[PDB]
């Protein structure tokens, strides 16, 4: 009878070292002499810890102003040039060129702890994979590599737990091989990023009093935005706690409302995991409020 093996987790230790620990265990153990038990493995906590890492990473990119390092335009964000959506909604999101990259980052990578999957941020998925093609070596590529590995690890383990549950051994055995490889791969990628994160020499651009999510959007630019687009923006701003100056602008302006609303009624937002129904209602409220106030 061969020793039982599992990959446990200390209560507060971070994703990075957690991986690193498992990385040792997996490297230094002749996996032939053990029988792997995935039951004690705490996906939920790992997911929690990972999303927490995604967040921290996102924060430093913004803070170190990594994105400015990474420009050649003044096009509203790194990916703007790569949108061919025609401001359509794509699985609940329209493309809005003003999104901060660090928001884009979080949304392509954080893991829905509920599903161990991704909540669609679709409008940027094409533009992003495009930018990647035309900018190997770019921080976004290096970062996304790293984060995808993150994602991978989680998925692998889920697949192991699941396969064990159904006795599918071919899978469980092979997936352990892979997991180890993802493990190292992750550790490399983690090292490799450290350069790409270095704060450029040009000074920190001055904070945006108006939104947590979008770069500034002047009234000219905002006006060219469509129903789905403004709609998309409203839903995003509701991820702040206090109402934003930006959403107030949008909701106060009488011209923007018809298209915002029809966007809503169109139903493209129905399937969002971010309580669309609730958000929509609240947006309607705030709009109703505002039109009362602007009746002077």
């Amino acid at each position: 009878s061969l020793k039982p093996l599992t990959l446990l987790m200390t209560s507060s230790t971070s994703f990075s070292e957690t991986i690193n620990q498992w990385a040792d265990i997996l490297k230094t153990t002749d996996m032939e002499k053990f029988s792997f038990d995935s039951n004690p493995i705490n996906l939920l906590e790992l997911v929690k810890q990972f999303n927490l890492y995604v967040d921290e990473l996102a924060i430093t990119c913004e803070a170190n102003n990594v994105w400015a390092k990474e420009r050649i335009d003044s096009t509203p964000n790194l990916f703007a040039l790569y949108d061919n959506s025609g401001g359509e909604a794509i699985h609940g999101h329209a493309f809005v060129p003003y999104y901060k990259e660090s928001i884009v980052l979080r949304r392509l990578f954080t893991v829905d702890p509920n599903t161990f999957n991704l909540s669609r941020f679709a409008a940027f998925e094409g533009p992003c994979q495009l930018y990647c093609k035309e900018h190997k070596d770019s921080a976004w590529v290096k970062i996304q590599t790293l984060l995808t590995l993150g994602n991978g690890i989680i998925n692998t383990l889920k697949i192991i737990k699941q396969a064990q549950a159904f006795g599918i051994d071919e899978a469980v055995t092979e997936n352990l091989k892979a997991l180890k490889e993802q493990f190292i791969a992750f550790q490399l990628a983690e090292a490799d990023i450290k350069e790409s994160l270095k704060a450029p020499s040009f000074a920190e651009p001055l904070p945006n009093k108006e939104s947590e999510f979008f770069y500034p959007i002047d009234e000219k630019a905002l006006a060219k935005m469509n129903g789905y687009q403004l709609a998309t923006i409203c839903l995003e701003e509701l991820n702040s706690p206090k109402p934003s100056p930006l959403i107030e602008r949008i909701l106060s302006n009488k011209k923007f409302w018809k298209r915002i609303n029809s966007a809503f009624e169109s139903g493209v937002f129905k399937g969002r995991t971010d309580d669309p129904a609730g958000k929509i209602a609240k947006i309607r409220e705030w709009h109703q409020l505002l039109q009362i106030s602007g009746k002077k």
Binding site: V111, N117, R120, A122, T148, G152, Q162, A178, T273
Partner: protein
């Protein structure tokens, strides 16, 4: 306690319907809600044919480019791959080309293919004519079905067909 075990694989662009297909077919349900599959997942339904009972180990894959490392692992093991495109999505069809290439690059020598045009119920928003698709399909002797995972339209028939097509080759 089963007669056969076929390993199946759905590939295709992101959001073309792979997972709703797998879901309607396995659990006979559908959720409107927007989730993108990470890496892979697998569901297992047992089918009966001729009238041997066949266990289907169906593996769902992520469409995105960045998952390819992973998805590509599960290619060699598959008895049959279903490539899926979304009939209202032009590029998704244009992409079948690469998807077929990825099959050549990764899966077995003799893997059983199947082209599926999903979201067929969206009549007004459609853009890929059954004909044009079916011709391309026939160009390569790969069976082809339009389907709506939402409506159930042909989802059952699709996996049946893929399964039968496999037994024939065993």
């Amino acid at each position: 306690e089963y007669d056969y075990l076929f390993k199946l694989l759905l590939i295709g662009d992101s959001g073309v319907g792979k997972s709703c297909l797998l879901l309607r077919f396995a659990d006979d349900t559908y959720t409107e809600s927007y989730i993108s599959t990470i890496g892979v997942d697998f569901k297992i339904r047992t089918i009966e044919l001729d009238g041997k009972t066949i266990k289907l180990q169906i593996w769902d894959t992520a469409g995105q480019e960045r998952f390819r490392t992973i998805t590509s692992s599960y290619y060699r093991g598959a008895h049959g791959i279903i490539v899926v495109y979304d009939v209202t999505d032009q590029e998704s069809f244009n992409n079948v080309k690469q998807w077929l290439q990825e099959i050549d690059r990764y899966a077995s020598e003799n893997v059983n293919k199947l082209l599926v045009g999903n979201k067929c119920d969206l009549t007004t928003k459609k853009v890929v004519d059954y004909t044009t698709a079916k011709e391309f399909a026939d160009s390569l002797g790969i069976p082809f079905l339009e389907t709506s995972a939402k409506n159930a339209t042909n989802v059952e028939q699709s996996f049946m067909t893929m399964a039968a097509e496999i037994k024939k080759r065993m």
